[PDB]
Amino acid sequence: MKTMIYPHQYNYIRSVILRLKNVYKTVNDKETVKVIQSETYNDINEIFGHIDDDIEESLKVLMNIRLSNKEIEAILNKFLEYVVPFELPSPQKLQKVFKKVKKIKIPQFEEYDLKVSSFVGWNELASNRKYIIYYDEKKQLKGLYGEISNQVVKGFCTICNKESNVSLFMKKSKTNSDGQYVKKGDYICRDSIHCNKQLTDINQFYNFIDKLD
Ligand SMILES: [Zn+2]
């Protein structure tokens, strides 16, 4: 209840964990495995507020110099019950965010999804447009939408910064004096839940938004 970790922090923890199951496959040096293991141990607990009771039990599982593929799915599954999910709003106070769009509606969203999501984005292919909602540095509904091209292509996403299936996302800004508005944007993961899954640091995303305004 007060050991509350964030979705982006969870993905970080996942990414460093899956890094360790790879040093049991790629790296030969005995001395390197030592510091790597130690390096990630300090990271995990530092991300928490305080290390609880079932945090000892959990860090234990990783100790072994050889982990397994069924070993990771909890730890990880066990880790998931520590995350604050994304706060999905009601269409009324969502209509206030996109005050101009005609009573727009939200899609699926399993629990697992809101547990990994720093922002939430869905595509409205009818109007070739990606809607994005997020909270910002003081828990509040901030929302945008832009023109998402209908081309998908391999390439790095300028939000999660990982090679993905990207489509150019273009928001309509405003230039010098009124009535003059040029389009700004870049390539981002077409599917935003995937983007989120690999969104390791929430600022990456903030930086992208501050690129658009
Ligand atoms: Zn991405």
Q: Report the CATH number that the domain containing residue 36 is assigned in CATH.
A: 1.20.1280.250
The rounded Å distance from CA 164 to ligand 1 centre is 7
Same structural domain for residues 77 and 137? no
Same structural domain for residues 123 and 44? no
Residue 123 backbone phi and psi in degrees, to 5: -100, 135
Same structural domain for residues 172 and 93? yes
Q: How far apart are CA 194 and CA 213, in angstroms?
A: 24
The rounded Å distance from CA 54 to ligand 1 centre is 32
Same structural domain for residues 119 and 151? yes
Same structural domain for residues 160 and 181? yes
The rounded Å distance from CA 163 to ligand 1 centre is 8
Q: What are the structure tokens assigned to 188, written together?
A: 């981002």
Same structural domain for residues 26 and 4? yes
The SS3 of residue 92 is helix
The rounded Å distance from CA 116 to ligand 1 centre is 13
Closest CA to 77 of 123, 126, 44, 112: 112
Distance of CA 135 to the CA centre of its chain: 13
The residues near 116 (Cβ < 8 Å, ≥ 6 apart) are 7, 10, 11, 193, 196, 197
Q: Which residues are annotated as a binding site?
A: 157, 160, 189, 195
- Percentages (nearest 5) of helix, strand, coil residues in the chain: 35, 20, 45
Q: How far apart are CA 210 and CA 136, in angstroms?
A: 11
Q: Which residues of 58-95 are buried (b: 16+ CB within 10 A; e: fewer)?
A: beeebeeeebeeeebeebbeebbebbeebeebeeeebe
| Integer Rg of the chain from CA | 20
Q: How far apart are CA 195 and CA 162, in angstroms?
A: 8
Same structural domain for residues 69 and 160? no
Other C-beta atoms lying within 10 Å of the C-beta of residue 191: 16
Where does a domain end: 85, 102, 137? 85
The rounded Å distance from CA 170 to ligand 1 centre is 15
Q: Which residues are annotated as a binding site for Zn(2+)?
A: 157, 160, 189, 195
Q: How far apart are CA 203 and CA 45, in angstroms?
A: 21
Same structural domain for residues 81 and 93? no
The rounded Å distance from CA 91 to ligand 1 centre is 26
Same structural domain for residues 139 and 41? no
Q: Report the residue count for the chain.
A: 213
The rounded Å distance from CA 188 to ligand 1 centre is 5
Same structural domain for residues 19 and 124? no
The experimental technique behind this entry is: X-ray
* H/E stretch holding 207: helix 202-212
Q: How far apart are CA 141 and CA 205, in angstroms?
A: 15
Decide if 187 contacts 157 (C-beta within 8 A). yes
Q: Which residues of 106-140 are buried (b: 16+ CB within 10 A; e: fewer)?
A: eeeeeeebbbbbbbbbbbeeeeebbbbbbeeeeee
The rounded Å distance from CA 200 to ligand 1 centre is 10
Q: How many domains does the chain have?
A: 2
The SS3 of residue 190 is coil
The SS3 of residue 12 is helix
The SS3 of residue 25 is coil
Same structural domain for residues 119 and 213? yes
Same structural domain for residues 181 and 159? yes
Deposited resolution, Å:
2.8
Note down the domain range covering 118: 86-213
The rounded Å distance from CA 30 to ligand 1 centre is 35
